[PDB]
Amino acid sequence: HPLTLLQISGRGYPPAPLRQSTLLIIDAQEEYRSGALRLPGLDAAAAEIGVLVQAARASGTPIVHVRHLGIQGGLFDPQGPRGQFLPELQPEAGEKVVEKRLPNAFSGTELHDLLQNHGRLDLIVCGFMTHSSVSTTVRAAKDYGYRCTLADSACATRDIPTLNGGVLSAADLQRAEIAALGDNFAAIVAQARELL
Amino acid sequence: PHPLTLLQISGRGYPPAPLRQSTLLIIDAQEEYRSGALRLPGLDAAAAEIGVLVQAARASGTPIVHVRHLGIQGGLFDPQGPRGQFLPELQPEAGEKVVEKRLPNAFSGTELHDLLQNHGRLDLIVCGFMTHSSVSTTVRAAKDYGYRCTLADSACATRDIPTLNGGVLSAADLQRAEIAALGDNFAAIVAQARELL
Amino acid sequence: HPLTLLQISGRGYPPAPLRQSTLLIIDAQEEYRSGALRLPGLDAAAAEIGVLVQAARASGTPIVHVRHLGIQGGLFDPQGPRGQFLPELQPEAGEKVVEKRLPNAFSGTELHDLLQNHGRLDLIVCGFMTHSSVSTTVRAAKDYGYRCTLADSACATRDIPTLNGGVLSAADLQRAEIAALGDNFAAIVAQARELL
Amino acid sequence: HPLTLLQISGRGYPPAPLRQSTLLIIDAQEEYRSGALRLPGLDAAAAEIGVLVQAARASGTPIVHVRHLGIQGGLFDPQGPRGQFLPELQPEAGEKVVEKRLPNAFSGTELHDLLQNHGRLDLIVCGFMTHSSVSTTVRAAKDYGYRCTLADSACATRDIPTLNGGVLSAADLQRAEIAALGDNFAAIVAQARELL
Amino acid sequence: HPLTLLQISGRGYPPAPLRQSTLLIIDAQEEYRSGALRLPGLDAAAAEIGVLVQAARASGTPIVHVRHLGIQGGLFDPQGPRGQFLPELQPEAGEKVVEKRLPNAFSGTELHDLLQNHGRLDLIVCGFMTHSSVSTTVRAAKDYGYRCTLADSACATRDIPTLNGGVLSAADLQRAEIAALGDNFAAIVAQARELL
Amino acid sequence: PHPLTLLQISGRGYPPAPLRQSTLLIIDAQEEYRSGALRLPGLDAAAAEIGVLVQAARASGTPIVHVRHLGIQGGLFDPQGPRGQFLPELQPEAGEKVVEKRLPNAFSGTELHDLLQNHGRLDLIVCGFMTHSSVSTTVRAAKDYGYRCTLADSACATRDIPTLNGGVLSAADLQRAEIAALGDNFAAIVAQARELL
Ligand SMILES: N[C@@H](CCCC[NH3+])C(=O)O
C-alpha cells in the first residue's frame, strides 16, 4: 500500500475536529442546483455540510462562506438567482462572506486576514467543485502553512470531458482529486460525522 | 453525454499554444524519480516527450525555465546528493534559468513570477512531475497571474497513491483525472508533445 | 506493396509473445544517456523496453542483458560510469549478463549457450544501436535457427554521416534498418505492448 | 558533421584499392534479372562489379564468387535458370565459388578458409541484395578481423514493405544500409573506378 | 588627487546604505579558517560581515549567500567540513544560497535572477577572497547595471607570490584590489559601520 | 616564505603559452593613453613589448584580435576623434579583426567569444590597457569560457588611482598587485614578451 508524500516526509497531520477548526464553505451556490452546473451529488454533499454548519453554530466554531462573483449574464451572476447561496446554506449571525473571482479563494480577497483573525491553523474545507475551487483553495492554503481537513462526502463535482471524446465520471474525478489532496495537501475523512 | 469545460461554458477557452510562442516550464525532472524512493512507472516515456519539447525549443530560441525541488538533507530531493540533481538528459544548457523551490507551487517563495514576466510570453507550456502535486499546483497558480497554460498529457507523470478504505489509485487513473481537471478550468490540453510543434 | 522474402519463401512467422520468448536487451548502457553517443530517442525506447521487462518478470520469461565491454578512456569504458547499465533497465533476480566486444552479441561470448539452455526458439531483441549491435545480433541469430521478433519502438539509433558530407537522420536509419530485418531476419511490430 | 563509430573509436581505415584486396562477389544470379526479384538497378550495378572483375583479372587480384542455393521451385532455385550466375559475372576457370544457404556467406561454408588462403586483410564486397546477403556478410567479416571496402554503385536492392502498408524505396534502403556499414563495418566509396 | 574613471565619466555613485541594498556574502566558508587558505584577517573581516548580517536581519534587508563548490575531500569540499559556511555566518530563515564553481558568482548561476527578484540596484558585496571571487563578482555585476558598495573591513585575502620569488602581502593586495574596484566598479568605504 | 597560487593549490595551473600556439588579444591600444586624458607613464614600454608580440605573430601566422573601446561623443575614447583611434604602431593589418566594446569586459555585448572560438586556440595571450580595468576584467571573464590566459607583465600598463582618505596608489604598485592577482587564479604570468617567442 503506497504511502502519502506527507507520511514519507514526516509532515503529515491527523484530521482536525470541527470544534478546534475554522469551517470554510466554498461556493454553495444555486448555479449547482438550477443553473448550468447541476451537480448530481449536490443534495448529499449539502446535507453533510449542514451537519458541520449545525455543529459549528451550536459550539460557536467560526464559519467563513466563500461566494464566487461571476459576470453579468454568466456563471454565478451576482444579480441573478444562480449567483445566490443555496437557501439551506445561507450565512447567519454575521458569519463572513468572502467574494472571489478566481478558483483560489485567497486570490484578490481578504480570506488570509479573516482566517488569521480567527487564529485556528486547522481549516475544514467543503463545498464545490471538488477539482476546481476546493482543490485550488486547499493547495493555496499549504503556502500559508494551514492544515486542511476534508470530508469526501461534503464536497461534490460533475462529469468532465477527457481527450478524444471521453468522459470522466463525477465519482472518478472526486476519488482522484480527494486522493491527490490527501497525498500532499490535507487530512481526509470519508464523512462529516468523523469530525464531530 | 458530452459535458463542456468551464472554459468553454465561460467563453474563455484558448487554443493550445505552439512552443514557438510559449515559455517552456519543466517541473522537477530530477533523479529522485529514476533512482530515489519515488521511482515513477512512466518516467522515461514522459521524459522522452519533454525531450521533444526541449530539442524543438533549443532549435527555435524558445525560452526554457527549469524548476528544481529543494528537499531535505539525506532524503527526498536531497540538495547535496544525487537524488536532487536533474536527470542527465534534461540538464539545463547555458542561458536556461533554474528556479529552486520548496513547495508544490513553483511560484511560492521563488523568482518564477519575475522570470516568466521578463520572458514576456503569456503562454506557458508546463511539463514534468508529479502531475497531481507540483504540476497541477503550479498550473492552477499560473491562472491567478493571468497566464495561459498548455500541457501535453504525455509530458507529465505521477505515481500510485493511497485512497480511503485502504484502496490504491493507479498512476494512470490519477494522471487521467488530474489532466482533465486542469483542462476543465486551467489549461488547454493535447495528447502528445508533437502537437505543440 | 512488395512482399518480404519471408513471405515469398513461405517461411514467415508471427511475432512471438513475450511469454514464449527469451528477451534479449542490447547495450542499455549510460554511454547513450550521459556519454559520447547521447541518443535523442533513448528514453522513448527505454520506456518500451521497460514495458517488456516488467511483463517478462511477471511471467517467468528469461531476460538476458548484453553489456558492451569497451576499453579504458573509450566508449563503454568498464571502469567509468558510461559502461554501466541504465538504472531502470538493470538486471534483477539474477538475470544473466553477457559481456561482448563486437557488434555481434554471439561473437566470443556465452550467448548461444545461454539461449540454448533457456530452450526457447523465439527471441525478442531490443536495445541500442538499431543499425549496429541490434541489427548484427538479429542477423547472426538466423545462423543458429532462432526466430527473432522486434518492436520498432524498443530500439534506437543516432544520426550518421553519408557520402558527400550528407547526414542520415536517426528516424530514417531506424525505419530502413527495421524494414531490412523484417524483410528476411525477423517478425516486426510497431510497439512493445503488441508482444504482451 | 556526425562522426562514424570507427572514427570515434580510432579504428577507422581508408578504402582499399582493388590491387591490395580480395574481390568478393555476392549472389550475381539470374533471379535478379528474370526471376521474382527484378532489381530496378541490376544492370548499372552489374556493370560496376564488371569494372572490378575486369581490373582484377588483368592484375591477378583474387576473386571469390558467392552463389545462393535456394530450393526446388523457390528463390535462387538451383534446378533451373534463376539459380545460375548472370552470364557476364560467371566465374572464369581458377576462380572459386562458395555455395551458401544463409544470408551470411561465412555460415556453413569454406569462405573463411578461401579468404585466409589469399592472405589479404582488405575485402572489396559487392553484389546483391545490399540490405540482406551483402550487409550480413560484411558485418560477419568484422568478427574475423577483415577490413571491408564497398562501392555504393556495385550493390543493389529492391523496394521492401514497412509497417502499416508503407514502402521503403530501393534507393532509400540502399542509402541507409551503405551508411550503416560505413558507420562501423566498412570504408565506403561512391563508384568502382575509385578503387582502380 | 587623481580622479576615478567613474568621476571622469560622470557615472559615479555614492556608497549605498544597507537599508536600500541587497547584502551579498561571498564564500564565508570553513576552508578559510581550517583548510589550505587560512586568511590571517578572517576573524576581523567575519566580525564586520556579522555587523552587516545582524543589521540586515533586524531591518528586513535581503541577504544572498554564495558558497564555492571545490574538490571531493579537498579545497571547498562540497559536502565536507571545508566547504561548509563558517558557523557564525550561516544562512537563516529563507535566505537563498547560490552555489558556484567559478570566481564569478553570476556565471551559470541563479544570482542575477535572485538579485532582480529583490528589486534593489545597490549591492553591498563582502567576503573572500578580495582579489578573486569578490573582485570578479563586483566586476561582473557592472555588466548587469548594478551599483556595488564594499566595506574594505568586510573583505579579506592572503599573501600571494609575484615574479622573482617576491611576495605581495595580504594588506598590499587588499589596498590595490579595493582601489581597482573604486576606480571603475564600486563605491568604497573603510568600515561596515559606515553603511548602517 | 613563498606562498602558492590558488591554481597551484587546486592542481589546475598551466604553463605560459608560447605565442605560436595562442590567439593574441590586444586590448584598447588607443591614442587616449598617449595624447588624451589618461596618459599612462608606462605606455611606450608596454607598446614596444606588444609590438614584439604583434611582429612575431604576423611573421608566424598567429591570429591577432584587436579590441577598441567605443566612448561617447566628446568623452574618453571618442570614436569620432583622434583619441579613440589605435596607436599608429599597433594598428590592425589586413584580415586582423577589431572588436568594439562599451564595457571593461571585452566579451560583454560583443562577438569576442565567437571570434576566439573561430580561431580554435584555448591559449590567449592578453595585453594592453589598463591592467586593472579592461585587461583584468577581460582575463577574469575568459576563465568562465574555459580559456587559458598568458600575460607578459611588460605588455600591460595602468595609471595612478586614488585610495581611501585622499591617498594615491602608484601605477607600478597597482600593476604589481593586479598582475599578481591574475597570476593567483586567472593566468600564467611571465615578466617580458620575449619569453613567449
Ligand atoms: N517487414 C516489416 C517492416 C517494418 C518496417 C519498420 N520501419 C513489417 O511488415 O512490419
Numbering used by the authors:
A (entry chain A), C (entry chain D), D (entry chain F), E (entry chain C): 14 to 209
B (entry chain E), F (entry chain B): 13 to 209
Authors' own words:
Our structural studies support bioinformatics analyzes showing that PA1677 belongs to the isochorismatase-like superfamily. Ectopic expression of PA1677 resulted in de-repression of Hfq/Crc controlled target genes, while in the absence of the protein, an extended lag phase is observed during diauxic growth on a preferred and a non-preferred carbon source.
However, only dimers of Strep-CrcA with the same self-complementary interface between the protomers were detected in the crystals. The crystal space group C2221 and the dimerization is similar to the Pae PhzD. This sequence is close to the active site and was shown to be involved in substrate binding. A comparison of the three dimensional structure of CrcA with predicted structural models of Pae and E.coli proteins generated by AlphaFold, using the DALI server supported these predictions by showing the strongest matches with members of the isochorismatase-like superfamily.
